[PDB]
Each structure stands twice: as structure tokens, then as C-alpha cells.
Amino acid sequence: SGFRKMAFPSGKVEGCMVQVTCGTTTLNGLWLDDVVYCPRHVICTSEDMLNPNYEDLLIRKSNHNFLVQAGNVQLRVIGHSMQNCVLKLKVDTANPKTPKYKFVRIQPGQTFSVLACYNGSPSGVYQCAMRPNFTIKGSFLNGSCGSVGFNIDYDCVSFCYMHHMELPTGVHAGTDLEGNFYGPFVDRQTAQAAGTDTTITVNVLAWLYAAVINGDRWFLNRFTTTLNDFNLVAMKYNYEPLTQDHVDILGPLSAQTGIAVLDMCASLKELLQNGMNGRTILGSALLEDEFTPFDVVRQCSGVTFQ
Amino acid sequence: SGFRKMAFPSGKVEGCMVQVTCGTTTLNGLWLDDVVYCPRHVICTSEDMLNPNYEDLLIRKSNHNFLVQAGNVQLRVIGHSMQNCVLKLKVDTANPKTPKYKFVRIQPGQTFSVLACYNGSPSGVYQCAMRPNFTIKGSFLNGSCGSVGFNIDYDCVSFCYMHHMELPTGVHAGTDLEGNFYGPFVDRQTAQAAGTDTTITVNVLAWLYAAVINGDRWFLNRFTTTLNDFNLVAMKYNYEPLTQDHVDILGPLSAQTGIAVLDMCASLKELLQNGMNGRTILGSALLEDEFTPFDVVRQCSGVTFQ
Numbered sequence A, B: 001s002g003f004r005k006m007a008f009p010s011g012k013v014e015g016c017m018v019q020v021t022c023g024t025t026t027l028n029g030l031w032l033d034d035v036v037y038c039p040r041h042v043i044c045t046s047e048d049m050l051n052p053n054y055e056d057l058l059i060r061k062s063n064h065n066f067l068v069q070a071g072n073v074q075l076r077v078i079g080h081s082m083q084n085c086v087l088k089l090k091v092d093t094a095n096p097k098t099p100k101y102k103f104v105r106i107q108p109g110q111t112f113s114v115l116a117c118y119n120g121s122p123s124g125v126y127q128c129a130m131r132p133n134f135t136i137k138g139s140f141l142n143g144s145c146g147s148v149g150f151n152i153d154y155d156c157v158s159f160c161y162m163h164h165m166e167l168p169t170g171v172h173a174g175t176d177l178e179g180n181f182y183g184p185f186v187d188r189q190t191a192q193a194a195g196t197d198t199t200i201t202v203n204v205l206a207w208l209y210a211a212v213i214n215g216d217r218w219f220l221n222r223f224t225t226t227l228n229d230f231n232l233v234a235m236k237y238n239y240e241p242l243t244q245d246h247v248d249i250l251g252p253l254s255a256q257t258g259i260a261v262l263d264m265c266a267s268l269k270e271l272l273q274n275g276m277n278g279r280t281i282l283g284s285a286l287l288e289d290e291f292t293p294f295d296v297v298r299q300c301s302g303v304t305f306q
């Protein structure tokens, strides 16, 4: 019993974090085999940030301009290249702690664990979602650039996020590990803003199923709804449209609880229209939307990793 | 910017988790140097659970009755002893991954990270508090016994919790790593219940300071209050009394924000008396009480570990 925002165990990623220093800029890098990945704006200076041309900036650098530390060990750079917004520093030593890994670009609505790091040393781990507007509501301070987000499937670390920047509203923007930004953001110090966000409907429904699995059941009703009529109510409350694919995803949770997906939609409809009226669900007074259907099944069933 | 429930990086603890099997019972153990710690009810059978005498139960066991697996490696037990409610299995091999560590018994109100494990394999990490009633609101399924809770100070893992049992309300009870239960609970299948809980006042105040550090400031007011008059309002709303020691702890956060502790108490008073009125603090519609003053400073300042 119980339901928590649960991050994946972070050990496999901790063994990959390093410090990358170029000029007066220090940030985190990700050491996998003999390559260190890090945000390319590590080559920027304090006045290069407004409108940098990273191709000129990089063609003016030597390998010895990059100081990479893995713990108290000084890694030598033997090659460098830029891929989109990430820099790849080839080093003379392969990380012996390299886990089985993949680089994956996630869809909005998907969740991942963030290992927050400063100076190549991990600070904390927490769970996030890719918001529909391609920001993440992270917890990041100066020096956290290059911290990564990730998922784990048994033994394989799927890296999906590298941190680059904070936006004026306090939310965060970054890239996949191939350096492609999530959303329209660019690694320039120019006016950018998040875009209006929406609530991840399919995830709210998953969390309601989590609540039922765990014994909260006060929000259910006898009603049902059509997918169409549900989506007309969702638009009103700034919720993402629910697709048939979302319905299908929610199948296992529906089968385990005996609550048809569309019946749980009718319950969400009533929750949207009436509020929660001083009651809580899974210890929240808000409708929670950073658990995927997979997250719920994982935590309510006990899946491990190795 | 941003504020998350942040767990400590879990790698140092992951390298210590093992599987302990005795009879038909499998649970998790903690392998530090050449000793494996685990709940003593691993020696209980399905009918021994109602009122076991662990001293007879243990005096009937041999070392070879204990199957310890560290990954795909089979550790040999060469000695066993009981200390309070934990069993200590001495094994012929010292864990080469043993971190610097301590065993500490925490006070209620203190927080810690839980590495949830099944069959010696970590499943997830999350942050908890010791509730005033000495339960924890965890997320635990069958097989999670022996999962530990912990804090980290730079390089040292302070282990503070080992999981033993779930109580009828879905909350959890366990011991320190020397096997002393937190609270009045006993490792018997007899009627036990949590005891009425209270909100951890000093932590709510810390979290309000977190909100100010992060730019939420709508809940402040010009008022102040005496410690006495605050504590009369806290009793009413089932909050823990605030002591001068709590006030002193909140000093750094007070100094960094320029908001006197008692001024923030006046704000909490107004929040208790008027509710939040459809507004949120740090993305919560509830007054959050599982962040200590130390947690806030750590996350709002960027402390790492190594």
C-alpha cells in the first residue's frame, strides 16, 4: 500500500557524472564509454550568450581547453564534436561504470527521473514529466546544466533529457541526449517563454486508478460518458484531449480495478466540475498528472531493475 | 528555481542490497562489511506470525538455513545473532561496495530517502518523513521488508530505517538499523494501529520559506504573533507545538528571506484559519510538512555529496 512519486534508483547514472570546465564555465557531463556529453553552451563566455554562433565558437577551441574531471581524476580530451546542441568530448578512457544504455526522445506526458548534479557530483533525485508545452517543472540551480533525466528498464538506462536552461517562469528547458531541444527553445539568451501548458489527462486517469488500487474510492460514480462528451469537458478545464490510444493504454488498469475507462472519465468529469470539496486523493488536494499508466502499474505491482 | 521532493542519490545503498531467504520467506537485507542486516521475522513461518518467541525460533536455526544472494552470487552465512528486532547474518565475504556509513535513530519530523526493494533488487527511491506517530507514509508491497531508509552527508550514508510491516491504515512501521521499532509497534501479527497523527509544524514553516525563496509570496501578511498565541492556534488544527528550538532552527531561512520566524507563523495562522482559497503553494493545494529546514536549505542552495 501507499503511493509516492518514485524515482528510479539513480546508481547507474551516478557512475556516469563528470565535471566539464571550459573557460570560466563549469557544468556537468555524462560519461558513457569514451565520450562525455554536455551542453554546447559550455563553450560560451559571459558576452557570447546573447547570440552565439557555436560553429565559430567551437572551431576556435582546442581539446586542451576542455577540463573534464571524473571525481578526483582528470580525464584527457582527445577529440570534440558538436551534434545539435550537445558537445561530445572524446576522452582517452572508457568509463568502466558505463551501464547498458540507450538515448531516447520521449513524448510529452512521459515521466522520467532527474539526477540533479553540481560540479559532477549528484545532489538529489526526483521524478518529472515532460509537460505538454515541452518544459519540465524541475528543481535546478546555477551549475545544474548537464544533469540528465532518465528511465530504467531492468538493466538498461534510457537517457531522455539533458538540462540546459531555466525560463522566466521558473520552469526548465533542455534537450534529448542527441542535443535536440524539447519544444521551440534555443540555447540563446534571447526572450523565450514556455507556452501555455495543459494537464496530462491520461495520467490523471492513471492516478485515479492508482487511488482505487490503494483504497480511495469516494470519487467514483455510477455514471458513464462518451469519449466525445468527456473531451468537450476536458477542453473547458485546459486538459489534453483523450485519444482512443490513451483509452487502450489504460486497459490493464481498467481490467485490474473493474472500472471501465469511460466510467473513470465520468468520475474525472465530476471532479473537474465540482472540485474535490475538501477531500484528498492519494494525499493530494490537486488532480495529479505526473504519473503515467506505466508508472502506476510499476509501483502498484512491484517491478524492480537489475 | 523549482522545488521537488528530492531523494538522496541512491547508488551507495543500491550496492548494499541483498536477498535473504529462510524457509518460505524471502525479503531484503543490507550488506555492510561482512554482516547482512534484515528483519528478524524472516525466521517466522505462516503460523509462527501470531505470537512468535524469536529466541526459540532462532535457537532452532542453523547458518545453512539462511540463503543470502548478492545479485547472482550466493553468500555463505558463518554466524547469526539477534539484536532487538533485526537479525545479523555474518557472511564469509565483506561487501566491497560498503560505503562510509553510520546507523542513526532519527526523531519524528525528520525526513529520509527510502530505497524500495524486492528480492534484493531496488525498485524506486522516494522521500519520507517519520510522522509524529512513528509511522511512515511509504509505498511498500509484499516483499519490501528489509528495504532501508537513509540520509547522506557528503560521503557518509546514515541509515535510519528498516521496513518491517504495514498497518491497517496503509501506513508503515519499522525499526532503526539496530532493530528498535519506531513507536510502540511490535513484530507480531496482533492488533496494532498507528495512533493519531499531527502535522509537523516546523516543517510546514520551512516549506513556506522555500516558497518565498522561490517567488510564491501571496500568503505573507504584515501581522505577527507570539509563540504562545501561535501554538494555541496550532493545537486547534492538530499541528505539533512549535518550540523555541524549532524557531532557532528556522533562523538561517529567516535571515535569507528577511521574514521573521514569528511573522511566518502569523502567515501560517492565517493559512490555517482561512484555507488557501483555490491558490497553491509550490504546486501544492495542501500545507506540506515533509520538508525539514535542512531539506529546504539543501535544495535551495545546491549541496551535493561524494
Ligand SMILES: *[C@@](O)(c1nc2ccccc2o1)[C@H](C[C@@H]1CCNC1=O)NC(=O)[C@H](CC1CCCCC1)NC(=O)[C@@H](NC(=O)OCc1ccccc1)[C@@H](C)OC(C)(C)C
Pocket (backbone or CB within 6 Å): A025, A027, A039, A041, A042, A043, A044, A049, A140, A141, A142, A143, A144, A145, A164, A165, A166, A167, A168, A172, A186, A187, A188, A189, A190, A191, A192, A193, B001
Ligand atoms: C546551467 O548551470 C548553465 N550555466 C551556464 C553558464 C554558461 C553556459 C551554459 C550554462 O549552463 C544553468 C542552469 C540554470 C541556472 C538557474 N537554473 C537553471 O536551470 N543554465 C543557465 O544559466 C543558462 C545559460 C545559457 C543557456 C542558453 C545559452 C547561453 C547560456 N541561462 C538560463 O537558463 C537563463 N535563461 C534564459 O536566458 O532564457 C531565455 C530568456 C528568457 C527571457 C529573457 C531573457 C532570456 C536563466 C538563468 O535566466 C533567467 C530566465 C533569468 C532565470
Ligand SMILES: *[C@@](O)(c1nc2ccccc2o1)[C@H](C[C@@H]1CCNC1=O)NC(=O)[C@H](CC1CCCCC1)NC(=O)[C@@H](NC(=O)OCc1ccccc1)[C@@H](C)OC(C)(C)C
Pocket (backbone or CB within 6 Å): A001, B025, B027, B039, B041, B042, B043, B044, B049, B140, B141, B142, B143, B144, B145, B164, B165, B166, B167, B168, B172, B186, B187, B188, B189, B190, B191, B192, B193
Ligand atoms: C514484508 O515484505 C514481509 N513479508 C514477510 C513474511 C514473513 C515474515 C516477515 C515478512 O516481512 C511485508 C511488507 C508489507 C506487506 C504489504 N506492505 C508491506 O509493507 N511485511 C509483512 O507482510 C508483515 C509480516 C509480519 C510482520 C510482523 C511479524 C510477523 C510477520 N505483515 C504485515 O505487515 C501485516 N501487518 C500487521 O500484521 O499489523 C498488525 C495487525 C494490525 C491489525 C490486525 C492484525 C494485525 C500486513 C501485511 O497486514 C495488513 C495490516 C492486513 C496489511
